[PDB]
């Protein structure tokens, strides 16, 4: 008395598909995004990375 396989199954496809993000929150998402895109159309500080100039970018001559 014994048995053996003869079939199989899966739950994935190792693949991906496109999407949409303008038919689930309408233009309201672009309204908020545009108001704060303006916040990125400008310069940035650097004093925060100067806090790294004492632990990840130090140097000494000679």
């Amino acid at each position: 008395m014994l048995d053996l396989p003869g079939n199989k199954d899966k739950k994935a496809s190792s693949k991906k598909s496109p999407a949409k993000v303008q038919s689930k929150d309408r233009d309201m998402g672009a309204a908020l995004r545009s108001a704060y895109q303006k916040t990125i159309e400008e310069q940035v500080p650097d004093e925060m990375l100067d806090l790294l100039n004492k632990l990840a970018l130090e140097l000494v001559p000679r």
């Binding site: 689930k24 929150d25 704060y36 916040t39 940035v44 925060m48 990375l49 790294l52 990840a56």
Partner: protein, 157 residues
Amino acid sequence: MSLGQQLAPHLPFLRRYGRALTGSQNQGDKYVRATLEAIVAAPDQFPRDVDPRLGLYRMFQGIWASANADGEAQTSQSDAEGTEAVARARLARMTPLSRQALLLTAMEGFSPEDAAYLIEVDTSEVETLVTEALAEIEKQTRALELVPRGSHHHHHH
């Protein structure tokens, strides 16, 4: 090379919405700088391998959540008339977190799974938070009027 090449290109993103999560430039400037100083002694707590932006937001909200938990902060506000007061003057009744889920799923396209990790809830809870957010949007977009009435009677007065 170094953290700066993964901090600088996302450095202003903490003010890209911090300007409306506390309503003050003095608070927004000290939160981003206090977020960095809180990592000068624990850079292992600031990974970016999950996403180049998911780690930036986790540490910034950590300082903010510690501020209102000690009275060092209060509810948000605005100082403009068409770029942050617009997000207040029309949504002054949305809960303090569905507004974060809104900027997390209508401005960033991120999945609900990592968006749930960004507010420490389950995936299905983010789905509810955005469903209630868009419901309060489509209902009014500016709350121009209200009418709680709908019925009457004429045999008791």
